[PDB]
Amino acid sequence: PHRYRPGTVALREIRRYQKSTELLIRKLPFQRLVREIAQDFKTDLRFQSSAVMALQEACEAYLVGLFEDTNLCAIHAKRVTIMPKDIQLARRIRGERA
Amino acid sequence: PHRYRPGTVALREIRRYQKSTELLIRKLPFQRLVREIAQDFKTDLRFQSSAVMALQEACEAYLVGLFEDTNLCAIHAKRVTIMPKDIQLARRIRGERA
Amino acid sequence: TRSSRAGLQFPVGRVHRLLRKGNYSERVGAGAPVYLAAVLEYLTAEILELAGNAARDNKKTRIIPRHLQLAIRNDEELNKLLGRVTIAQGGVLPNIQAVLLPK
Amino acid sequence: RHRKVLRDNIQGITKPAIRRLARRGGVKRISGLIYEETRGVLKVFLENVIRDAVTYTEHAKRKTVTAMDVVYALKRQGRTLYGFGG
Amino acid sequence: KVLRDNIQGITKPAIRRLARRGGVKRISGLIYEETRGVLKVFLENVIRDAVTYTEHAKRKTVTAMDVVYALKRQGRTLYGFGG
DNA sequence: GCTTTTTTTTTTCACAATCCCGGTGCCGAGGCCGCTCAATTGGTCGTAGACAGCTCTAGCACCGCTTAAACGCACGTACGGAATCCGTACGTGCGTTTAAGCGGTGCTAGAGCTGTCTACGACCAATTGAGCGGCCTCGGCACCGGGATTGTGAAAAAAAAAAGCTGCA
DNA sequence: GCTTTTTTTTTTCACAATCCCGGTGCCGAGGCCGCTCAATTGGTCGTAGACAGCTCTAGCACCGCTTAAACGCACGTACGGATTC
Ligand SMILES: [Ca+2]
Ligand SMILES: [Ca+2]
Ligand SMILES: [Ca+2]
Ligand SMILES: [Ca+2]
Ligand SMILES: [Ca+2]
Ligand SMILES: [Ca+2]
Ligand SMILES: [Ca+2]
Ligand SMILES: [Cl-]
Ligand SMILES: [K+]
Secondary structure, three states, X not given: OOOOOOOHHXXXXXXXXXXXXXXXOOHHHHHHHHHHHHHXXXXXXXXXXXXXXXXXXXXXXXXXXXXXXXXXXXXXXXXXXXXXXXXXXXXXXXXXXX | XXXXXXXXXHHHHHHHHXXXXXXXXOHHHHHHHHHHHHHOOOOOOEXXXXXXXXXXXXXXXXXXXXXXXXXXXXXXXXXXXXXXXXXXXXHHHOOOOO | OHHHHHOXXXXXXXXXXXXXXXXXXXXXXXXXXXXXXXXXXXXXXXXXXXXXXXXXXXXXXXXXXXXXXXXXHOOHHHHHHOOOOEEOOOOOOOOOOHHHOOO | OOOOOOOOHHHHOOHHHHHHHHHHOOOOEEOOXXXXXXXXXXXXXXXXXXXXXXXXXXXXXXXXXXXXXXXXHHHHOXXXXXXXOO | OOOOOHHHHOOHHHHHHHHHHOOOOEEOOOHHHHXXXXXXXXXXXXXXHHXXXXXXXXXXXXXXXHHHHXXXXXXXXXXXXXX
């Protein structure tokens, strides 16, 4: 029974997704999450579909790029597994977070 | 023969400078740098005194701030000593250099 | 006077002129510079009230850049408003990373 | 008005999808503790971006958030976005 | 020696003092040059803009405003010189 | 300097994954059309700013003292990081469950457009005190020394907790 | 049990730094002076935008089948991290 070495598929995924541009979050789950959060601020709101798409474009990009910063932060501490503290440093140096 | 252990004056010096507000770079050398660098964009430039001090508040401010972020990276790599690769990472993450 | 009408020290007149002139819009409502004076006045007062405390807490009668820096950096909300601002002669908040302290 | 109150949709942002985003960011190995932490971050992004869009809406008196509402809001957060007007 | 590389006028002692005020304890030797590099890029960027202001205003004297306006553009807003 | 294994390297096939083509089909890039409203023409009038001339501000050069800071060198402690070692958190793959997505269907809130009318804000001329710069004063605050007090640590001394050896039962 | 080492802990002494006394003198905050222009005013005019009414876009709900993806568990390797030096 054939079995790929841990990392060899992660590395493939890494190349698969860098080559592409389609959105990586499931479009309805995300849409439900937009609407849920928006209630906090105002009820019985409609969203243009383009406004929701504009939000999932702006989100995915923000995280995808935070994950870059975060990966350097893992590697800086001679690791390969990104950990919570990695994100938190990335965000503290970005100044998103006290 | 009284001898304080490594790092024990450091801490005094930290406490000391964090309590104070006074420029830490010598004012004349700084100024001689500001004219050296100004030449490369225009010759026979004169400066208001306060223009140089506006430049020097701004510089130290940046440097101090960068050192905080540098320290944080160095501590993130389970280290106590800041090194260039700390500065360079904190600048990579600030979006200052690619 | 207008500032007197609005309950304000800040000059509702002066503010109104800076808006027409200052390339913000073609026309300026009669409310805007009243409101705008009030908000500038509010924020001004919160910093001074906080920095005037920092002076007295250092037995000093005159407020200095350090007192403002301390007022401002210790107030979660004022810090965020002035997060990308540098206060000349403010200095920085005493703070030493824990893993550096002895033992 | 014909049923609209919302559930708990943050778990909709599945571990598969967070893993795919990390992949696009060139991340090879991911700790257990990332996925929940990521949702916190994502939530705080969205909360901030929608608050501001929702403001721009409430000002123009609309009950419909436009793409421009979201665009104007994103430029405000220093996250300028290209290809939905403006 | 002692000749016309004014950047070196930025002494180790002064670089040490900054990183102190920035809560730094133990400082690698390589850092005082890295710092020197970084400081220059900082000034280059700010001063280029400040003098770009100067040349536009048709003057030979760099004002404190010119710097203030430059520092705003670089996102390093400075209070207490004419803001 | 060996003899005996582990460590690292090599070569040989099996297998999955990705790559590249032509074929096929759908739809949106591209473009033509006809009508609109915004860019252009040609005119007028008023003032923003270019310009010359003069004022005096503050930037520069220089010099000669007095330190405080930079400097260079001796010395060693605490640090960075290399090397080892061990437990399991993570990746890979499977069978099972879920609901996203798809395309369609039916309803209407509300986005967005129109026309109407007036409340309000820009424009003006006349007046005038609020706030400007200039200048004088007087006490806050930097800096002084003496000595007590309290953090802040380093060394040296005591205690305890491991390291190695035992002397019977 | 004992003795014998490392390690850990406690105790004692040295030294900066703070705060309390005593002081002095400089320099700029503060506030008054005397002039000036920018804020105020009531008048006149034009149109911005409130409003109300009308159109019809597009946003929201609902369904049922298909199958791609998420899900959760078994399995073991290479990673993270502790320790040593
Ligand atoms: Ca075509
Ligand atoms: Ca199962
Ligand atoms: Ca209209
Ligand atoms: Ca009206
Ligand atoms: Ca005055
Ligand atoms: Ca006084
Ligand atoms: Ca006294
Ligand atoms: Cl108004
Ligand atoms: K503008």
